[PDB]
Structure formats: structure tokens, C-alpha cells
Design a protein around this ligand. Structure first.
Ligand SMILES: CO[C@H]1/C=C/O[C@@]2(C)Oc3c(C)c(O)c4c(O)c(c(/C=N/N5CCN(C)CC5)c(O)c4c3C2=O)NC(=O)/C(C)=C\C=C\[C@H](C)[C@H](O)[C@@H](C)[C@@H](O)[C@@H](C)[C@H](OC(C)=O)[C@@H]1C
Ligand SMILES: CO[C@H]1/C=C/O[C@@]2(C)Oc3c(C)c(O)c4c(O)c(c(/C=N/N5CCN(C)CC5)c(O)c4c3C2=O)NC(=O)/C(C)=C\C=C\[C@H](C)[C@H](O)[C@@H](C)[C@@H](O)[C@@H](C)[C@H](OC(C)=O)[C@@H]1C
Length: 145
């Protein structure tokens, strides 16, 4: 397993997926739903995406739940427009390496397509992460812009 950094992200093949509450068209830039999060003594602002579909399904479900909104989110096929790196939240935490192929970037995502069809996770599965994210939100440690 090879860590993805600003030195080697160009070696990562798409496609990529992003889950969100944002309602945008193909060709639009995602400048919304960046996450302000605490890391190494400061707030950083990143948008998150994956080379696999399922992490974006989680991203859409949690975007909708944290926003208190009804229904399924949106999943976009995306390209980063600047350097990206492993999401440290999902890298050498619960699993070795970055098995969900989840990445973060400081620059907007380009929407290049839409995912229409997916099977969601049961809400019970979403509740434990939502509880944790609600607390981090209250503490200003992870905040959707
Ligand atoms: C694609 O990721 C998803 C599913 C992966 O599928 C799956 C199978 O692969 C996972 C990987 C590779 C992990 O590394 C991981 C993990 O590191 C983690 C929790 C569980 N966290 N919590 C719930 C259990 N509770 C005891 C502790 C808090 C996980 O479940 C997973 C996990 C999975 O379930 N982290 C922790 O336990 C700790 C120490 C802190 C958590 C902090 C916040 C809450 C999270 O970081 C937020 C910012 C998000 O990152 C997640 C919600 C992910 O949603 C997205 C869209 O990113 C989600 C895991
Ligand atoms: C008393 O301890 C606190 C210090 C407060 O004050 C303050 C100013 O000083 C801090 C120090 C000195 C840290 O060293 C620190 C830190 O190392 C860290 C996060 C924040 N972590 N996350 C932010 C969200 N993001 C999506 C995931 C990573 C922090 O906020 C802090 C932090 C503060 O905020 N984390 C990480 O580096 C990594 C790599 C992962 C952590 C994973 C989970 C999420 C955490 O373990 C959860 C379960 C909590 O245990 C902490 C958040 C503590 O919060 C409480 C109330 O217990 C906090 C350390």
C-alpha cells in the first residue's frame, strides 16, 4: 500500500465520486460542502471524494442527515482540480492503509457526471457516525460550510 500525497496524486486514476446535499449540474464546480475541521492546531478546509462508490454513498447519507434534510443525497462523478492526498480520517485508523480510497483536497471538485442508482445503508448503520459527527459539529471540530 502506497500513501497518496501531494508528491504522487497524479498516479491516482479516477473516476472519483462525491456525496453531498448540493444540487448542481454536470460541468459545475463544487465550492460548497467543504468541511472546516480541526487538525494540527488549526481549522483546515477540505472537500472529500473517493475512487470507490460506497464512501460517496456514506458521504451523501451523512450530508443529508447532518443538514436535517429529507431523502437521498446527490452523488456526483468528479475530478479534483488541484492536489489531493489520503484522508487521514480513513487512513491507518480503523484499517491499515486507505482501503476505501478516500481523498481530500483544498480546491474545488469539477462535476463530470451523476450517479443515479445506489442502495443505501440502513439508518441504524448511519446513526452511530451521525451521533459522533453531531458532537464534533457542536464542538466546532468538523463543520460543513
Ligand atoms: C467512507 O468512510 C465512511 C465509512 C467507511 O466504511 C468503513 C468500513 O471504513 C472505515 C474506515 C476506513 C475507517 O478508517 C473508519 C474510521 O476511522 C472510523 C469509523 C467510525 N467512526 N465513528 C463511529 C464509531 N465510533 C465508535 C467512533 C466514531 C469507521 O466506521 C471507519 C470505517 C468504516 O465504517 N473512525 C473512528 O472510529 C474515529 C477514531 C473517529 C471518527 C471520526 C469521524 C466521525 C469520522 O472520521 C468522519 C469524519 C467520517 O470520516 C466517517 C463518518 C466516514 O464517512 C465519510 C463519508 O467519510 C465513514 C467511516
Ligand atoms: C481532551 O482532548 C481534546 C482536546 C481539546 O482541545 C484541543 C484544542 O487540543 C487538542 C489537542 C492537543 C490535540 O492533540 C487534538 C487532536 O490530536 C485531534 C483533535 C481532533 N480530532 N479530530 C477532529 C475531527 N476530525 C474529523 C477527526 C479528527 C483535536 O481536536 C485536538 C485538540 C483540541 O481540540 N485529533 C487528531 O489529531 C486525530 C489524528 C484524531 C482524533 C480522533 C477522534 C475524533 C478524537 O480522539 C476524539 C474522539 C476526541 O478524543 C478529541 C477530539 C478530543 O476532544 C474531546 C472533547 O475529548 C480532543 C483531543
Amino acid at each position: 500500500w502506497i500513501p497518496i500525497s501531494h508528491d504522487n496524486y497524479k498516479q491516482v486514476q479516477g473516476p472519483f465520486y462525491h456525496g453531498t446535499k448540493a444540487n448542481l449540474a454536470i460541468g459545475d464546480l463544487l465550492t460548497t460542502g467543504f468541511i472546516s475541521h480541526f487538525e494540527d492546531g488549526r481549522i483546515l478546509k477540505h472537500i472529500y471524494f473517493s475512487a470507490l462508490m460506497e464512501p460517496a454513498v456514506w458521504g451523501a447519507e451523512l450530508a443529508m442527515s447532518l443538514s436535517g434534510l429529507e431523502g437521498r443525497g446527490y452523488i456526483y462523478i468528479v475530478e479534483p482540480t488541484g492536489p489531493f492526498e489520503d484522508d487521514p480520517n480513513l487512513t491507518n485508523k480503523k484499517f491499515p492503509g486507505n482501503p476505501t480510497q478516500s481523498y481530500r483536497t483544498c480546491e474545488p471538485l469539477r462535476i463530470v457526471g451523476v450517479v443515479e442508482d445506489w442502495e443505501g445503508h440502513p439508518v441504524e448503520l448511519i446513526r452511530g457516525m451521525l451521533d459522533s459527527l453531531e458532537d464534533l459539529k457542536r464542538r466546532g471540530l468538523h463543520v460543513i460550510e
